[PDB]
Design a protein around this ligand. Structure first.
Ligand SMILES: Cc1c[nH]c(=O)c2cccc(N)c12
Ligand SMILES: [Zn+2]
Length: 208
């Protein structure tokens, strides 16, 4: 059901997605261990992910959440990094894309910082890095992230140093309370609360 439409670099939509990618890079407390050392990306391709069934599954759930939260879906665009991007774009998010050992429980995790999601492209903690070179800081191999539409509804705020949402909530927000430069991370517990809208293919760039 899924088709991928390549966006032109001249398209305003390509440019706005690239800017969110680039502008939300930060340094990480692991010195680059999980995701590599870089300050910016080389964006190689941005594709719009188009699947009618998956979209309608998303909007159906979005309406339910909205009606439970004074007509406010609390929809965000957030990054997701996974070695299972291909299953996600074809079959959608589900319990198999949950992070069982995550700090907010077994749910599906999303980041405001693209560089946070980049730490997960090759697995938890970056796995063993790229398939070809076993390098978590590989500057050659092509990486992919998803930029996703995510329904948060009423989000449980966790001040921060498949399962179920906290009762009376539709998601969890992990608010950073130590690292002043970190942006928030979010967890949903229903795969239908996210749609993988853009597939971004990129390399991390070696600092000059
Ligand atoms: C676990 C995980 C996977 N993919 C992500 O993009 C992500 C983003 C923020 C926090 C996480 N824990 C994750
Ligand atoms: Zn490599």
């Amino acid at each position: 059901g899924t088709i991928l439409i390549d966006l032109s670099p001249d398209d305003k939509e390509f440019q706005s997605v690239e800017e969110e990618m680039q502008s939300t890079v930060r340094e990480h407390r692991d010195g680059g261990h999980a995701g590599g050392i870089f300050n910016r990306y080389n964006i190689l391709k941005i594709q719009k992910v188009c699947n009618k069934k998956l979209w309608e599954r998303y909007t159906h759930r979005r309406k339910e959440v909205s009606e439970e939260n004074h007509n406010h879906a609390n929809e965000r665009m957030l990054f997701h990094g996974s070695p299972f991007v291909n299953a996600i774009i074809h079959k959608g998010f589900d319990e198999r894309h949950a992070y069982i050992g995550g700090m907010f429980g077994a749910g599906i995790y999303f980041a405001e910082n693209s560089s946070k999601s980049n730490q997960y492209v090759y697995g938890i903690g970056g796995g063993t890095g790229c398939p070809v070179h076993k390098d978590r800081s590989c500057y050659i191999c092509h990486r992919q992230l998803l930029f996703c539409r995510v329904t948060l509804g009423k989000s449980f705020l966790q001040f921060s140093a498949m399962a179920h949402s906290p009762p009376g909530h539709h998601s969890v927000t992990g608010r950073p309370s130590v690292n002043g430069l970190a942006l928030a991370e979010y967890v949903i517990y229903r795969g239908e609360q996210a749609y993988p809208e853009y597939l971004i293919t990129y390399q991390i760039m070696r600092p000059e």
